[PDB]
Design a protein that fits this description.
- Chain B: This is Gene 3 protein.
- Chain B: It comes from Shigella phage Sf6 (Shigella flexneri bacteriophage VI).
- The structure is cut from a larger assembly and holds chains A (70 residues) and B (51 residues).
- Chain A is mostly helical and 70 residues long.
- Chain A is 44% helix and 0% strand.
- In chain A, helix 1 packs antiparallel against helix 2.
- Chain B contains two helices and no strands.
- Chain B is elongated.
- Classes of the chains: A mainly alpha (70), B mainly alpha (51).
- Chains A and B meet through loops of A and loops of B.
Chain lengths: 70, 51
C-alpha cells in the first residue's frame, strides 16, 4: 500500500502516465490498509434520557439518568 | 421406639425433606407471580443487570 501510494505520488518526477492496472492495484492495497484500520463509534445515550424502574436504581444503580459523557 | 430425642429428630428431618421435594414448582410459580405483581421492580427481574 505504501509503495503504490508513493509510486503514484512520484511518477510525475519522471513524467510517466500510470496505467489502469497499477491504478487498480493501488486502490486494492489502499482499501486493504483502510479496512484494516477502520473503527466505528457507538452513539451513546443523550444524558437526560431516563433509565427505567427495571434497573432498580438507588440499590443496584446510583443514578436515575444516563451520564452519557467522558 | 425412638427413646431418645436424637432419634426422633432425624425422622422429622426426613419427613420435612419428603414434603419439600415434590411441592417445589407450584410454590415457585406462586412466589414468582406475587413478586411480579407487587414488587415495584419485579417485572424485569431475571435480567436486572444487563448490557
Amino acid at each position: 500500500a505504501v509503495g503504490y501510494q508513493l509510486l503514484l505520488r512520484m511518477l510525475s518526477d519522471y513524467s510517466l502516465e500510470p496505467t489502469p492496472q497499477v491504478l487498480s492495484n493501488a486502490q486494492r492495497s489502499y482499501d486493504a490498509l483502510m479496512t484494516d484500520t477502520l473503527v466505528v463509534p457507538s452513539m451513546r445515550r443523550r444524558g437526560d434520557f431516563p433509565v427505567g424502574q427495571g434497573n432498580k436504581y438507588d440499590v443496584f444503580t446510583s443514578d436515575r439518568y444516563y451520564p452519557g459523557d467522558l | 421406639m425412638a427413646e431418645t430425642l436424637e432419634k426422633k429428630h432425624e425422622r422429622i428431618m426426613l419427613r420435612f425433606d419428603r414434603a419439600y421435594s415434590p411441592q417445589k414448582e407450584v410454590r415457585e410459580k406462586c412466589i414468582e407471580a406475587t413478586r411480579f405483581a407487587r414488587v415495584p421492580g419485579g417485572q424485569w427481574e431475571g435480567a436486572t443487570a444487563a448490557g
